[PDB]
Specification:
Strand content of chain A: under 5%
CATH architecture of chain A: Up-down Bundle
Largest sheet of chain A: none
PDB class: oxidoreductase
Organism of A, B, C, D, E, F: Escherichia coli str. K-12 substr. MDS42
Number of helices of chain A: 6
CATH topology of chain A: Ferritin
Oligomer: part of a larger assembly
Keywords: Ferritin, Iron-binding, binuclear metal binding
Number of domains of chain A: 1
Chains A and 6 copies: Ferritin
Bound molecules: chloride ion, fe (iii) ion, mercury (II) ion, magnesium ion
Entry title: Revelation of Endogenously bound Fe2+ ions in the Crystal Structure of Ferritin from Escherichia coli
Largest interface: A-B, 28 and 28 residues
Helix content of chain A: over 70%
CATH class of chain A: Mainly Alpha
Distance between the termini of chain A: 37 Å
Order of helices and strands of chain A: HHHHHH
Structural class of chain A: mainly alpha
Amino acid sequence: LKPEMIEKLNEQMNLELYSSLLYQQMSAWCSYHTFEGAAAFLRRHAQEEMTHMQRLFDYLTDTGNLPRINTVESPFAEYSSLDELFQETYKHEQLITQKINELAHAAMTNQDYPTFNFLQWYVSEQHEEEKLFKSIIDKLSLAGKSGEGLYFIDKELSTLDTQN
Amino acid sequence: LKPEMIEKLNEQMNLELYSSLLYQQMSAWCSYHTFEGAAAFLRRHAQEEMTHMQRLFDYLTDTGNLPRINTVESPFAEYSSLDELFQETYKHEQLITQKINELAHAAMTNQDYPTFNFLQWYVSEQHEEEKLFKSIIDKLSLAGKSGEGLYFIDKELSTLDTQN
Amino acid sequence: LKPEMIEKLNEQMNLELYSSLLYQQMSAWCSYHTFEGAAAFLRRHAQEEMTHMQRLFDYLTDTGNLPRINTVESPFAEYSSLDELFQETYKHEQLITQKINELAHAAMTNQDYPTFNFLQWYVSEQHEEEKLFKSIIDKLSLAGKSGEGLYFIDKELSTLDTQN
Amino acid sequence: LKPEMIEKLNEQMNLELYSSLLYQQMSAWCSYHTFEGAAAFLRRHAQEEMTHMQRLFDYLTDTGNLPRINTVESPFAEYSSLDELFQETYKHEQLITQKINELAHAAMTNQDYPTFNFLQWYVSEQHEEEKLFKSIIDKLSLAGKSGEGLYFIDKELSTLDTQN
Amino acid sequence: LKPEMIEKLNEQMNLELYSSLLYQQMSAWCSYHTFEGAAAFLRRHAQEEMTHMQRLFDYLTDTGNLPRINTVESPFAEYSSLDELFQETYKHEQLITQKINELAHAAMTNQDYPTFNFLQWYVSEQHEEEKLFKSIIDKLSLAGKSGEGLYFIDKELSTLDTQN
Amino acid sequence: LKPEMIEKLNEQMNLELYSSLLYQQMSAWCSYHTFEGAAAFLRRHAQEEMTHMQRLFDYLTDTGNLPRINTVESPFAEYSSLDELFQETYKHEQLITQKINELAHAAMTNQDYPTFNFLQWYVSEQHEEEKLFKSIIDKLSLAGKSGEGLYFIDKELSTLDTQN
Amino acid sequence: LKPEMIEKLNEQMNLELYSSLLYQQMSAWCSYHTFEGAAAFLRRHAQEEMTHMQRLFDYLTDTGNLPRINTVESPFAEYSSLDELFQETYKHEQLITQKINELAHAAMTNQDYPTFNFLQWYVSEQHEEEKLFKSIIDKLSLAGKSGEGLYFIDKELSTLDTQN
Ligand SMILES: [Cl-]
Ligand SMILES: [Cl-]
Ligand SMILES: [Cl-]
Ligand SMILES: [Cl-]
Ligand SMILES: [Cl-]
Ligand SMILES: [Cl-]
Ligand SMILES: [Cl-]
Ligand SMILES: [Cl-]
Ligand SMILES: [Cl-]
Ligand SMILES: [Cl-]
Ligand SMILES: [Cl-]
Ligand SMILES: [Cl-]
Ligand SMILES: [Cl-]
Ligand SMILES: [Cl-]
Ligand SMILES: [Cl-]
Ligand SMILES: [Cl-]
Ligand SMILES: [Cl-]
Ligand SMILES: [Cl-]
Ligand SMILES: [Cl-]
Ligand SMILES: [Cl-]
Ligand SMILES: [Cl-]
Ligand SMILES: [Cl-]
Ligand SMILES: [Cl-]
Ligand SMILES: [Cl-]
Ligand SMILES: [Cl-]
Ligand SMILES: [Cl-]
Ligand SMILES: [Cl-]
Ligand SMILES: [Cl-]
Ligand SMILES: [Fe+3]
Ligand SMILES: [Fe+3]
Ligand SMILES: [Fe+3]
Ligand SMILES: [Fe+3]
Ligand SMILES: [Fe+3]
Ligand SMILES: [Fe+3]
Ligand SMILES: [Fe+3]
Ligand SMILES: [Fe+3]
Ligand SMILES: [Fe+3]
Ligand SMILES: [Fe+3]
Ligand SMILES: [Fe+3]
Ligand SMILES: [Fe+3]
Ligand SMILES: [Fe+3]
Ligand SMILES: [Hg+2]
Ligand SMILES: [Hg+2]
Ligand SMILES: [Mg+2]
């Protein structure tokens, strides 16, 4: 693997880790403001993100490289409401999406067909990630013009994305 | 909850999160240096620490507080030996243990009995942690002053501590 | 299909056939030199390469072309060590990998998307091949600077990579 | 999604629908001319083509677009024979293949990796499609030079690809 | 079969095909305006219409006729609201119901009892269809004077006329 | 029931009896001329026409009338070929169809709704009968213009069921 | 083992390998000329031949020798038709048969009773091989004086020699 691709893969690993912690932290905000269902959702999703993290971790070790976990910025933020929080989440998943595309671009330009192939899993998962987080914005924009409706989506989020 | 206990509980949460990443990182070093068994052991243990972390996360939120994930220092380190790695593992667990003892002590002197009770789970865990990582160092100082001993410890670690 | 892709696909088919025989031959050397475990591993792998070969055979026939089995060079070789043997195994797989990358590249620049798609199966396989044969070299450079280490790698290889 | 891509994808959705209706229509001609087995095979394939259409439709909607089903030209046609009819199915699947490769190319050169990834399902499918239709024509050339020949291929057609 | 009957049956087959495509199109409006339950309902019902279409297709073939898929008018349309959309679906099923009655009447009138008998399936189907779509119109007018209500109807639509 | 209706229904039971006997006699011809598969089919179908007869028998007894089996004309006929035989089974089922239409019409015209309803079963059945016997004539014309094609049609006929 | 017998065994191993590749190549010719059933047969038989190859490979290793895979001649040939191809196959199996007899002869003349015993498996399998390939010539000479019959044996070959 070229040093370029090793580092870009390594950096996405780190971004995948940050995303785990961000959703964890966001679940805390949810709990502190009584949205137990949102909190359960983010907590489950934080674990998914760790899984994404580990898949890159393993590609790196499998190709004879040493994964490097860098300084991880605090994910703490103030959120004005549950709507803004999920705005931030979809916005963040779009950043992940861009970064995966930059990674596939670099793979293609360097003729690193193994890494381009590896990254297809992330290209398609990121498609499912945007679908999921936008539907949450969309359910909120629908039911959430009232205090009685915020309680209802919270109940949905409680079991969203577990029906396996 | 007294604000000193909140801060401390929050410190320990972050230390457990850090430990998670430490062992994950160390798992990386192991694989890069050919010890796939130590690697699978440490990956399994990284996941455990994440549970230790979340149990503190949950206690803070249950008590009406907002846990704060802080910056994580990079666990990256270029170890000279499997031996130098597990020496630092044990060192690190003794530190965790110390910090749990300090938190228990503080609970006692603030007459925070709910927190002292809560922490007994960690005091108990840490005794098992220190046993586990001491038994690994022990296994190294016996079998492996050789590549054909380090080979066999690694064999053992591949399945070490796997529930039944 | 463009006649350059036909020729190349046909080259790769023949290279996979050759690889089959190479590992079979190497299996012979192992048994003659007392390593029955490496031998059973390599026999199992020879069979795999035959499947890699036939998947290319099938693609050529599916696309209206007639695959041509060419002369196979003798894989015979008098290796100095189990180590010299698996070094050449890894070397050989890196070459296979290179040739698959060259075929993917050619598919791209000829805008042969059906073939690029077809080859993703090989790009993916080769990542697993390189991992497998690198992990074997690794296992040798650790345990076995001795007959009582070469004994144990051979034990492992006897069942190495056996599906569940 | 870039506007060029939206429109190409939409046009291909529309081509899949037409394809469904073309094969539905072709099953009628077959039933009317005694080829109840060819009729049945085409019935099944019409159905498959509708699932190819739905998949595009959902990709457009998943990406926040609004697919638009345009006016569909009557697929009605006369055919001089069963051989001729299957010649037109094969020509028509090649047109679909060509169109899918144009989409794949457009995605590549616009660095739309999510759509490139999405379209791989089709590249893959269309290879199986040409294989299937090629072998129906190959079967017609071999056995079906006679009146009873047409009877045996029809009998084969009735259970070919097993989707009833 | 009398020619009046063939043409009317074939017109009806085409109307069912159009109805399929209309509901599929309607499912996009729904998806693009956030009503994923409505959309999934319509999507499942587009499939049902395709089977209504095939059943007429087969009756024409079984009676020695050649059915003909004509040019299909684009189903695209603007809808000011979810209430406007389900209004139009209901008007449309009433139109189908009407056309089926004209067919039934034409069959009595031509003393075509075999066609009259075949149409009974559709007569009773359209009764179930008017029931279903009415029950939607109705469940709209009740729950959803507000955007809070629209949420639950959509949630209902997602499983309506489904399982077990 | 009205007097004209009783005798029409009694006429039709007799026609169904005759049909049972006709097909019995046809399978006899089939055996004598070596088409044992055709014979098995026609034998099974004879058994079906008896059930048709018994069902009109039972409708007559159940409405308080006394069904009368009339003299049956001998169905004996010395057919020039299996083609001529199956042509006449098909003319015959058309006559039965026609007579069921005349009975359905009569029942409408005399407001005898209970008999009209009863007959619906025959109307749908005759549709299934014309399909099935056409489907045989159609096979005969596709793969029976010789000595080697009869062999497979006969083979086919031997397990061709009449139900669904 | 005497060097004579080691080499003759080794050479038969090589002939058994060539035969694997010859049948593989022949299956390609079959597929390219539409005989999918013949192709499936040869492909299955190619695998058998590899098994024969491996049985000699193992006798050699089991007797303390190193199997040697020699240059393998390309098996590519032009065949005028499916009859000539199977003429070549039976002709080739007769060569294998002769070579096995020469081998048993040499074993007997050298008083190598272990090798003579080992070779009995090949003597009897070669009897079954000639039976099988001659029956194919014989089925061809029977059904294959027409284009309609070549299609029929192909269908047989599809499952010939799998009924286990
Ligand atoms: Cl690095
Ligand atoms: Cl982007
Ligand atoms: Cl950027
Ligand atoms: Cl950038
Ligand atoms: Cl890909
Ligand atoms: Cl894939
Ligand atoms: Cl302490
Ligand atoms: Cl444990
Ligand atoms: Cl490379
Ligand atoms: Cl494997
Ligand atoms: Cl078109
Ligand atoms: Cl249009
Ligand atoms: Cl056309
Ligand atoms: Cl026409
Ligand atoms: Cl024709
Ligand atoms: Cl093309
Ligand atoms: Cl409209
Ligand atoms: Cl329904
Ligand atoms: Cl009488
Ligand atoms: Cl008469
Ligand atoms: Cl009539
Ligand atoms: Cl009246
Ligand atoms: Cl030798
Ligand atoms: Cl001989
Ligand atoms: Cl000789
Ligand atoms: Cl000789
Ligand atoms: Cl013997
Ligand atoms: Cl024996
Ligand atoms: Fe992720
Ligand atoms: Fe994500
Ligand atoms: Fe811990
Ligand atoms: Fe610990
Ligand atoms: Fe390979
Ligand atoms: Fe390989
Ligand atoms: Fe298609
Ligand atoms: Fe309908
Ligand atoms: Fe409807
Ligand atoms: Fe009857
Ligand atoms: Fe009948
Ligand atoms: Fe053999
Ligand atoms: Fe053989
Ligand atoms: Hg892919
Ligand atoms: Hg014997
Ligand atoms: Mg034409």
